[PDB]
Structures are given as C-alpha cells and as structure tokens.
Design a protein around this nucleic acid. Sequence first.
RNA 1: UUGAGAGAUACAAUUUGGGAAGAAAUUCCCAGAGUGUGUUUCUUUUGCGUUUAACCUGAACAGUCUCAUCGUGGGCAUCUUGCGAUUC
RNA 2: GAGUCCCAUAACCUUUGUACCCCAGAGUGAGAAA
RNA 3: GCGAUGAUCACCCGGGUGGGUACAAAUGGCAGUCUGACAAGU
Lengths: 253, 45, 51, 232, 139
Amino acid sequence: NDIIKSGLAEKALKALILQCEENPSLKNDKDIHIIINTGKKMGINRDNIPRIIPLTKYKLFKPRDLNILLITKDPSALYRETLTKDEHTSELFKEIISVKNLRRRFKGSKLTQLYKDFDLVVADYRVHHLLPEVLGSRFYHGSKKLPYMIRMSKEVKLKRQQMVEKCDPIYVRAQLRSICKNTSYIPNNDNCLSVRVGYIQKHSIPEILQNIQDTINFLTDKSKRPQGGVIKGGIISIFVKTSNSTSLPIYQF
Amino acid sequence: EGTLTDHERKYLNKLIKRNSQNLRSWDLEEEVRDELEDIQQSILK
Amino acid sequence: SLAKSPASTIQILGAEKALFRALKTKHDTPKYGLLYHASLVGQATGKNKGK
Amino acid sequence: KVVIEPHRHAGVYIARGKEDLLVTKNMAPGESVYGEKRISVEEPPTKVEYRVWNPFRSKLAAGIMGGLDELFIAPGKKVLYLGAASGTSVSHVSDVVGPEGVVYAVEFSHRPGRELISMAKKRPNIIPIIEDARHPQKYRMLIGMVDCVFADVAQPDQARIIALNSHMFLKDQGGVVISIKANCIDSTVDAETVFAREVQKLREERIKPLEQLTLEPYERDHCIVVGRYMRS
Amino acid sequence: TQDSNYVRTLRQIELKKLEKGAKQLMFKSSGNHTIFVDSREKMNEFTPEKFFNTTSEMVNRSENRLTKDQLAIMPKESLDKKKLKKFKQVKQHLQRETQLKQVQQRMDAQRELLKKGSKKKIVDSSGKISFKWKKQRKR
RNA sequence: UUGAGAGAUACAAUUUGGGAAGAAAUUCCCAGAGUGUGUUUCUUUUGCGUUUAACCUGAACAGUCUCAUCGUGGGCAUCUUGCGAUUC
RNA sequence: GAGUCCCAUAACCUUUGUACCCCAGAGUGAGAAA
RNA sequence: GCGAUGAUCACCCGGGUGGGUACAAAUGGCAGUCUGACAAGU
C-alpha cells in the first residue's frame, strides 16, 4: 500500500487529468494506463489472451455501459436463441454472431466499422484462436479491443468423450460482469507492461490509486499464479499515461 | 536398591533424553509419515 | 519341484535362453528343450519331433 | 553401513539404517532356510551374520511389530513350538533361544515334516517331533520342561491342545503364547467375539491372560494372546 | 498369441519384483493391543508409561518400546526422502502390474473371438460390450 | 421431530500419568481419558402402509443377413483427433 | 501351432572368503663407492 | 678390497582407507519357465 501513501502518485494523476483538459490533442483520450517496468524478462510469449486482474475495491465498468460483441461457435442458433430469450441475458449483448458469418459479412473496411461500434469483444474460447485471422490486425494490436475468452456453460471436456453443448445464461452474465469490473492485462516477453486502471471523469484520483495498488498486489503475488504473480523480481518503476500522453512517473526503485 | 539421590534421578534421566534423542533420528519425521501412511494403505490393499 | 511343474515347462525345461529371448522379442519359441535327447524323440523325424 | 541396534526382547535385533527390518542372529551362518535376505556386520571387528524376519510369513514376527509387552521366548530358554509347519518361524525361534536354549518343534503333516527334519540337521538346538499335538503323551520322552509354549495350530479345538501340553510340559509361572485365527473357529461372528471366547477358555485351563494384540496389517482376522501358566 | 506371450512375461517380471521389494520394506503395525488387569482399581489408575515403564513418547513406538533402563553420519532429511522413494518404488511396481494385467485380459478376450464357435455381442446400457457363447459342446 | 445402544470426528470448560527446569508454587514437552454442544457411521425397538422385488434359466443376435479380424478411403482440429481397448 | 542346434550343463555383474602385488616394460644402459 | 658375466633409475589417522592378479562359494542380480481343442482317415 506504499504506492497510495506516496504523494508522488497523487500529484502525477492531478497533472495528468488537468493537462488532458488543457491540451486539445488529448481531448479524445479517456482511459488511464499504468506502465510497469519489470526488472527481468517475463518470458511469456504474447498469446493475445487477456488475463483478468480482480479489482476488489472499485468496479471499472458494468456490462450495461459497454457495447459487447459475442462471437459464438457455428451454429449460433442455440446460443443466440437461449441468450436472447433469458431475461438476464436478453439485453446483455449488442450483437451475437458466429465465426463463419463474421468472416463472410465483414471484410476490409467493414472491419474498421466493427472496431469503432463495439467497446468490448467476447468470444467462445473454442473459437478464440480463429479470430486473429478474421478480425484482422486492427483488433489485435494495441489491446484496446482485444477479444476476451468466455465459457458458455460450466460443462467440461473429458478425453474420449463428447462435450454436451449447453448455454447457461446466468454463467455468461456472471463472467461478463467480472470482465467489465475487473481490469485485464496481456503477458509479453519483455519488461514493459500496460494495464488500464481508470477512466477519466468517472473515477476519482483516490479510486484510481486504489486500482493501481490492486493491480500491483495481484501481479506481484506469487500465490495468484498462473493468472497473477507474473511480475517476478519486483518492479523497477511505474508510470501513468493516457493513450497519447507520455509516461509520468509515479514510482521508481 | 532404590536409594537414588536427587542428583542420581537427574543424571540417569538426562541419559533418557540423550538416548531417546538418538532414537528420534531413526524414528523419522511426522510429515513424511503422512505420505508413507497413504502409500502403505495403497500397497497393502 | 519338478512334479509341481506343468507339462509345458518340462518340454522346454533346458532351453530357457532361447525361450525368454523369443518371448521378449516376439519370435517363435523352442519346442524340444532338454527332452530332445530322449530315445522316442530321436525315432521321430521332421515336424513329428515337436509333436 | 547398516546400523544394527538392540531390541527390547533379547535375541532380537533391528537392522536400522536405510532399510530397517526385524532381524535375528544366524545360528548356522552362510545359508538361508527359506531364501530370506541375510545381513552381516562387523562388530569389535568380526562379522556376525544376521537373518531377516518377515512379519508377513511368521505370525510371531507380527507380534514383535505390534509391540507385545512380554515375550517368554528369550536366549537360554526351552520353548515348545506347536504347529511347526516348517523352519520358516522355528528357525528364528531357534535363533532367539541361542545355542544354550532348545526348541521342541511339533508337527503332524508328513510333507512339511520332511522339510522340518532337513532344517533341524543344520540347527542342533532344534528337536523335531513328528507327532500329533492332540496326544502329548506320545512324545513325552523327547521333551523336558519348557519355559514357554508357543502355538500356531489352526484347529477349532486348539485350546484343548494348549491345555494338555501346558499341563504336562510347561513350568509353573511359565509362558503361553497363542496365535488365533477366528475364521477357523467361528466365521459368522466378528473376530473380537471369537477372541473373547478363546481368552475365557484359557482361563478355565488355569492360564492367566496378560495381553492381546491384533496382527493387522500383517494378517487379517488374527490376534496373539499372551498369558502365564499359574498352576496354583 | 505372441503379443499375449510378450505382455504376460512383462507382468510376471513385475509381480516378482513387487514380491522381492515388499519383503525389503517394513510396515508399521496398526492393531489393537488390549491389556488385562484383575482389579477394577488397577484399571482406573492404569497408565501406559507405568505398565511399559517407559517414556510417553517411547510408549507410542509399537515396533520397539524400550523401558527407561534400556535407555539408561547421514542427514536425517536425506534419509527420510530416500525412504519415501523406496515406498513409492514398490507402489509403481504395483501400478505397472495392474496395467499389464488389464492389457493382457483385453488381448485374451479378443483371442476368444478368433476361435471357432457361435457368439452373440451383448451391449449393456453403460455401453460395455461382451460376447456370450452358445451352449454347444466342443467336438 | 419414535426409543435405546456402540464408534469416529470438530469445538468449549475441566482433569489423569511420565519427563525435564525450578526451594515450593510455577514453566515447558510427551501420552491419555470422561463432561456439554454440533456433525457423522452402524446396530436394533416401536407405529403405519404394502406383498411382492431382483436375478438366473427353456430352441430368446442375425434378409433390411449378424459378428470377428486384417487393410483402404473420407469426416470430425469451430475437437469422441481416437489407449496393442470401441471416434463416425 | 511353435528357433534343441548363441554350451541356463552357461555367460556377465555384485557380495564374501583365501593367497599374493603398489619400479620402468620390446624397460633404461655406465656408472657405483669416496 | 665393485661393474657390460650388467652400475643406476596411491591416500589418510604404530594403525586405517584406495587400486590389481588368481581361485572358490552364494536359496545374491540380470531372471520372467511356450499355446490350449481339434487332428487324421473313407
């Protein structure tokens, strides 16, 4: 909790929020990111699979706030019908589409239109590895709209047996609520890391500071492996920045 | 003859710790006995 | 000890080297063992010796 | 090297070290009577050969692992072993008594008896008696008074066999050790009920029971009853 | 037939290895040990340490309970871990034996189908398949 | 939500014996029981209803012919991706 | 149906016991003693 | 009171470890003893 106590963190956030108001070029910048300089190489190849960091104290977003796109295994008749009928998930998804239909309908410039319309993309884990070919480069560089893996039902796969295909609406809604409130990170085989911690004009400075400490604790705690505890050997320095603002230091070793 | 003095009942009883100390090395520790007990049941059954 | 052995063992009693090699390498096994030198086996000829 | 250490009961050792086993000194060194592993250790240094005692093969050894308080079998004591099927356990009993003591091995079935005789030649202190234990009067000549009576006979009327032998060849305040198989006596009822009856029958025969021990996991449905023969 | 021969030979070796190893190992006894006392008072005042005349921690050792009068260079942890290894090793022999046993049984069942006779395939609700042979005497 | 009995385990109060270290009280280590509560296993008593239940067996797979085994070709990787075993 | 014909009447490894050995090896080749 | 008929040239603490040659023994190890109902004649 030393980071929150340190005044350096508060002043930088005050400077960052203020100068976004002042500078026109940063007018479209809305999210707050922290840049973490790990001492040693993580050694994890970037799998493009988001890793959720639980933020206990505060919730970044709710499902009702964001455009959510669900990509399902073909055929989507069962999942679309079950989700659209159940009251809990009736109004949860902006659009439900299958992989084959997504590939056929959207190509080229249409992929850019899909990128803008949707704030969050979620996909069945079975079809996640196919998406990089389909969605294109734009979704898969930068990590702003990187798809999230979700599981339709609590059924499990057993070798030499066929999984029963079912859709559990309450489980899907529960996963999506967790995805929105909890921030996410992607491992890479280099020191630098970027994690979203706050949203300008929604989160106060004390809340963003708490989110940062939650991120640091989860990422450093070896007990939380394999999802957490990826930052071995401590953190050399931590910065704060928006998408187009530079790194303002908040901690240095 | 059961004529032990207060000191006699101390030196002899020190030996009890001394030799029993030697045996606990052979006796092996509690944690491993937890695994050994599980392995023993599987083999015996 | 010999009395408690089945008849199959007595047939191949003296050819353990060839038997266990063949068993482990999935090849054909011996068929005479030490009994090959019995007079009756000598009288037989061809495949009849194994029988 | 393996650190053989003394045991509570004289004539018994444990080859403590890495592989710790119950162990007895070999009377006739250089050979094993049923292929048991043999350990030799130099002691000031002269090597003394030792034999492994397998509890799963001998019920008496299962008693040692169970922690029997008192064993009347000890060096320099005469022992009467009833139900000596072979030299599997009698040889170890011969080891414990040592050259000074003697073991009276009693067997009925002829086929294991011939195995017993071939072993007795190696061990001078073992006197093999091939006769029915139900009629002790037949072999009274070959047996002197005995400090302890050990019985592994698996017969329904075993308590009578112990009484006749104990009344005859057991010294006053002598030893009585019995291994009981409840399945032979009564399979319908649980083992504890059967053992209670056997203790009662011994008491009627002027044998005071001292302790009782179940032999699990070495054997299922078995226990060893240790008593003292109080003629008075 | 040769496959059945090969696996059985492997299974026989594992069984013998298991028998030799288990003899080397020593198993701690787990059995009730009752003591008989003639007087009710002797029971109530009974104490294991007094009866065995030994220290309380010394009492709980069934294999070697040494009375006080009798009481009167390798690291232990390395010895302890290596002891666990031997106990695991005999268990691994047992697991290999059962696996070879199951493998042999399935091969033997297949061989019975190759032999002459009239057989009907019966399938249970669980999906297990078995063959029931007609009641015909062999000529 | 019947009665009684035996065992195991979790907790709370309390107690037995052995050892050390202390002038004694007292401190620690070891082994252990019974009491109250809760959970759980088994044994049987009683009240009520009910009279059959399960399995095996007779010439009981196979014209839309059935089955075994060795091969060939293709589908399932958006996964039964297939064990000297039976993926379609 | 099926390798006696690669000595299971055996080879190799380990333990123990007995008896000897710790200089060069196609050994070197004029010193040694005072 | 010399010589070509031949001069010269492992370890550790009196004790224990290390290495080598030969022979004998081991109920010490490798190491586990093939298949199982048809075949031949008119």
